[PDB]
C-alpha cells in the first residue's frame, strides 16, 4: 500500500465537498457547511493496487502530491478563476509540472455555460487531464480521483 495527498481546489459552491464525500462515503451530500475545510481519508484500489488517498476538501495544501481543479459546468466565473489556482498551486509547490487534473462538476445539469471544449482546451493548454463529473449521479467522481492519482504515479 501507499498513501496520496490530494488537494481539492476550486470557487466556492462547485462542488468541492460533494465530490470527496461522493467519493468516500459513496452518495451525495447536498448541503454542507460551505466553510468546513477538512482532510478526508480512504483506502481504494487503484488498477489493482490499494491506496490510502488523504484528500483535503478546501473552503497542509503544502504538502499535496496532486490537485484536483474543480469549475461548475453552470458557472463560468468558476471557469474564469481556475487559472488563479492552478497558478497558485505551481506558486505553493515552487514547481511547474505538478499533477493535476480539470474537473467539470454538475454535469448532470442543464444550462451549462461552459463547453466542453472550452475546458477541453483549457486543459490541453495546460497539459493536464480533464474529466466532467456529477457530485449526484456519481458521473465520473471515480475516474477523476484515480486519474490524479495515475498523474501522480506518472510524476514518480
Ligand atoms: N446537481 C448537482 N449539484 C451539485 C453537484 N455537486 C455539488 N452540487 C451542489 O452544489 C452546492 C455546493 O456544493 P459543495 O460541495 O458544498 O461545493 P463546495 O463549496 O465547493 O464545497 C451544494 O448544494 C451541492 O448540493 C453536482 O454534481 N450536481
Ligand atoms: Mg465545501
Redesign the pocket.
Known sequence: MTEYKLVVV??????????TIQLIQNHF????D?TIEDSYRKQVVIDGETCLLDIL?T?YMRTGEGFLC?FAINNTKSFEDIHHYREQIKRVKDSEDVPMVLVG?????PSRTVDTKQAQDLARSYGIPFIE?????RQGVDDAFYTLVREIRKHK
Open positions: 476550486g470557487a466556492d459552491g462547485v462542488g468541492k465537498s460533494a465530490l451530500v447536498d448541503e454542507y460551505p476538501d473552503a474543480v462538476n454538475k454535469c448532470d445539469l463529473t456529477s457530485a449526484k449521479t
